[PDB]
Design a protein around this ligand. Structure first.
Ligand SMILES: [K+]
Ligand SMILES: [K+]
Ligand SMILES: [K+]
Ligand SMILES: [K+]
Ligand SMILES: [K+]
Ligand SMILES: [K+]
Ligand SMILES: [K+]
Ligand SMILES: [Mg+2]
Ligand SMILES: [Mg+2]
Ligand SMILES: [Mg+2]
Ligand SMILES: [Mg+2]
Ligand SMILES: [Mg+2]
Ligand SMILES: [Mg+2]
Ligand SMILES: [Mg+2]
Ligand SMILES: [Mg+2]
Ligand SMILES: [Mg+2]
Ligand SMILES: [Mg+2]
Ligand SMILES: [Mg+2]
Ligand SMILES: [Mg+2]
Ligand SMILES: [Mg+2]
Ligand SMILES: [Mg+2]
Lengths: 116, 221, 245
RNA sequence: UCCGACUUUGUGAAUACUUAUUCCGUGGGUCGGAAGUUUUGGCUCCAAGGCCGGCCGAU
RNA sequence: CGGCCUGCCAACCCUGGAAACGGUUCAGCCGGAGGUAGGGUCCAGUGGCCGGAAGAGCACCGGGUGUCCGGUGCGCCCCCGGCGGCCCAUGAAAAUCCGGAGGACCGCCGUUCACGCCCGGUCGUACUCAUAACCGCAUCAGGUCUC
RNA sequence: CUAAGGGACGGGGUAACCCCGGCAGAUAGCGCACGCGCCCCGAAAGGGAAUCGGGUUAAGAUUUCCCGAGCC
């Protein structure tokens, strides 16, 4: 005992291997792409962003962060987002500014969706 | 090789830093270790009444190893052996066994019934009031008894832990002479001395430092 | 009535000491084997000011006796100590100002400061600026020593108690007139909430035993029993005499 | 708050003891018995060496 | 933001050796514990030139022209530097970052270098800040911290 | 991130609500088997990774959008 100080010794601890699962339902992704992308904005200010900055405006879930948004637009419309700017509006909803990469034309995407 | 050389270090008060030492006696132990060590010291310092001090006198090592090697002959059957004996009887569809008796209530009953031929008492029954009266009862009933070290040793014989008392009522005819020689030695101690034993207190031993500093004061006279 | 000001200080609410800019407790290094049997050299690195303390403190660095580490100490500085000076602590330390010695090693008449009351106390006596204790006599049978405290009282201490050689630095501080309420305000700003004292005769009876009256006067003897309850024990407490001799 | 009784509260000599209790110190770091570093404001740890993982060096 | 230059006031280095003392500030003060002098190192800048960058912005003329040269200061605001004074007053801490002492260990393996590749979450962000967006029952001569 | 300060494991008190943090309790872990070992909250004026110029709206951006140029 070269130390005059006693320390608690290191003891083995096993991991949890339960005899039954506490949850048996698999657990389903309730924040899927349809919850993330609710609907696009069609205001006059929102329509200007389409042809001026290659940008689509969406109303998004409050629980959706920027990473889920760009993954959602890719799985919904097969387009690539260059960047996503988000805000929470004074009405309490979340609004996303989705700028598409060059070689994606938001006006063509806007025509396919139906907002134009 | 001339390159090799000694590089001694002088370990003074303001000298080289000392190497790792044992430092065992200066270790600050957990509270559980400190309480059990102080409990041993307190029992040494406090005057121990004779009825408790008598458990300090234990069976001799030579006698104890003789008695236990004989107590091993009369071990009760283990759980598997009892199961096997049940099956063997069931195949026919026995004999009176000679085994050690144990359990404080059962041993106490045998002694008052005058059937105990030898009583073995453990020296470390933690509630000491369980067996503190036992040497008096065995001596009153004229029963040879001894105090041996280890309740866990007594427990091992009966396939338990901490038997705390063992009783022999019967011995085999192959062991009558050996059991009798054992019996007289256990009677010479523990039974014929019980009367003189009932007056010895023996519990006032001080610490080594306290002893050394009284010897000096005694030598200064 | 209401709780008097003397009683309210024990709650320690606004009467706690002002210690936000203090440099740490000033005291000897913990007694150990090297000090008990030999000497240990440290070097003074700084002489610093401690708010609320009249005496300067000395920062001293030792080498740890068994760990590869530095050991930094801070105690009250004796007068004459200086930076870059070697100080020695222990049984075999030389009788020089700034050294820390057991009382057994200090002859009769020596001037000492920061004197321990119990062995390993790290210094309890004669710590204020300009103060010191005097070694009066030694008893080898009981292993005790007699010292004279700054108040004049004789005291019996174990001969193994440690003291620093010399007197505390910063003496003469209270000979200078303060001259100003503002100088007193700054002095107590770094000590405690105590300075501006209102006379008890200037109060109402609800606040003080001296309060009230159509003239400012105590109206009863200002000497008070030693066993008076708090709130009643004001004025001169358990005084054997009064007046100016 | 002072003061007395009981309790905590024990042991042995013609006042002593120490383990209860109380207080102080330490990162519980050289305690008891025996045997055999004053240097100048510098650095100092994790052993060289010897002998068979082991012992001395480090009673 | 990047490169080169410059290099204040202090601080530091090398040579040398000072009374008939000298150097020096508005004030101080400094020198055989090495001054004056000579020659250098570093430090900071919100300093200079180039890149950025004239392609911008601005002012004119109907695409075009120009965007230049000096002077001054007990001036005002901000920041910095370096001295002096004052205290029975001596005027936070931690995260974070950098440097160093040592050298166990290690060779086709080391590399705090340049260039090159990818990524960067959540919440706030409008407006008033007051003789009308705050409190005083009000669109109240009051009150309410700043640049 | 820490400041004055606040809460709080164990322990102590308390009929319980609750009141006490230095009273030290095997302190619950950290590097490379081996080695070491003296909780959180609390500042949009304290400390602190890194951005600039120009343009743009009815309403934004006194550095978030656009252009260009950097940085961590
Ligand atoms: K009251
Ligand atoms: K006050
Ligand atoms: K007064
Ligand atoms: K009065
Ligand atoms: K904004
Ligand atoms: K108003
Ligand atoms: K902050
Ligand atoms: Mg945002
Ligand atoms: Mg009045
Ligand atoms: Mg009154
Ligand atoms: Mg020059
Ligand atoms: Mg340019
Ligand atoms: Mg132009
Ligand atoms: Mg201004
Ligand atoms: Mg190195
Ligand atoms: Mg923290
Ligand atoms: Mg605090
Ligand atoms: Mg609790
Ligand atoms: Mg915080
Ligand atoms: Mg800040
Ligand atoms: Mg605006």
């Amino acid at each position: 005992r070269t130390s005059v100080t006693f320390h608690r010794p290191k003891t083995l601890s096993k991991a949890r291997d339960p005899k039954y699962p506490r949850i048996s339902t698999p657990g389903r992704n309730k924040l899927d792409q349809y919850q993330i992308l609710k609907y696009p904005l069609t205001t006059e200010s929102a329509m200007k962003k389409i042809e001026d900055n290659n940008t689509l405006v969406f109303i998004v879930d409050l629980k959706a962060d920027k990473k889920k948004i760009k993954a959602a637009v890719k799985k919904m419309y097969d387009i690539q987002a260059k960047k996503v700017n988000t805000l929470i509006r004074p009405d309490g909803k979340k609004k996303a500014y989705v700028k598409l990469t060059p070689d994606y034309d938001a006006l063509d995407v806007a025509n396919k969706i139906g907002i134009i | 090789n001339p390159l090799f050389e000694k590089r001694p270090k002088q370990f003074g008060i303001g000298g080289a830093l000392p190497p790792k030492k044992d430092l065992h006696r200066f270790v600050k132990w957990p509270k559980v270790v400190r309480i059990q060590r102080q409990r041993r010291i307190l029992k040494q310092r406090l005057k121990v009444p004779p009825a408790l001090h008598q458990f300090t006198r234990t069976l001799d090592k030579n006698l104890a190893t003789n008695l236990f090697k004989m107590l091993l002959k009369y071990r009760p059957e283990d759980k598997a052996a009892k199961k096997e004996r049940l099956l063997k009887r069931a195949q026919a569809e026995a004999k009176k066994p000679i085994v050690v008796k144990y359990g404080l209530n059962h041993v106490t009953y045998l002694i008052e019934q005058s059937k105990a031929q030898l009583v073995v008492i453990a020296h470390d029954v933690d509630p000491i009031e369980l067996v503190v009266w036992l040497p008096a009862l065995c001596r009153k009933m004229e029963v040879p008894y001894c105090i041996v070290k280890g309740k866990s040793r007594l427990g091992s014989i009966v396939h338990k832990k901490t038997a705390s008392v063992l009783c022999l009522t019967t011995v085999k005819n192959e062991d009558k002479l050996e059991f009798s020689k054992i019996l007289e030695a256990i009677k010479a101690n523990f039974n014929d001395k019980f009367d003189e034993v009932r007056k010895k207190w023996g519990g006032g031993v001080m610490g080594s430092k306290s002893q050394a500093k009284t010897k000096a004061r005694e030598r200064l006279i | 009535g209401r709780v008097i000001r003397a009683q309210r200080k024990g709650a320690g609410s606004v009467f706690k000491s002002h210690t936000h800019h203090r440099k740490g407790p000033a005291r000897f290094r913990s007694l150990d084997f090297g000090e008990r049997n030999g000497y240990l050299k440290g070097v003074v690195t700084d002489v610093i000011h401690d708010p609320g303390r009249g005496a300067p403190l000395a920062k001293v660095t030792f080498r740890h006796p068994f760990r590869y580490k530095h050991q930094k100490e801070l105690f009250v500085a004796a007068e004459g100590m200086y930076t870059g000076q070697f100080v020695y602590c222990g049984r075999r330390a030389t009788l020089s100002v700034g050294n820390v010695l057991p009382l057994r090693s200090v002859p009769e008449g020596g001037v000492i400061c920061n004197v321990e009351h119990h062995v390993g106390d790290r210094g309890v006596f004669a710590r204020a600026s300009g103060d010191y204790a005097i070694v009066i006599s030694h008893n080898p049978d009981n292993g005790t020593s007699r010292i004279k405290l700054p108040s004049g009282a004789k005291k019996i201490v174990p001969s193994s108690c440690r003291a620093m050689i010399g007197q505390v630095a910063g003496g003469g501080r209270t000979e200078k007139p303060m001259l100003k309420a503002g100088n007193a305000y700054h002095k107590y700003r770094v000590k405690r909430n105590s300075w501006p004292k209102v006379r008890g005769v200037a109060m109402n009876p609800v606040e003080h035993p001296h309060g009230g009256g159509n003239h400012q006067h105590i109206g009863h003897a200002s000497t008070v029993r030693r066993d008076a309850p708090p709130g009643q024990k004001v004025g001169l407490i358990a005084a054997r005499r009064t007046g100016r001799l």
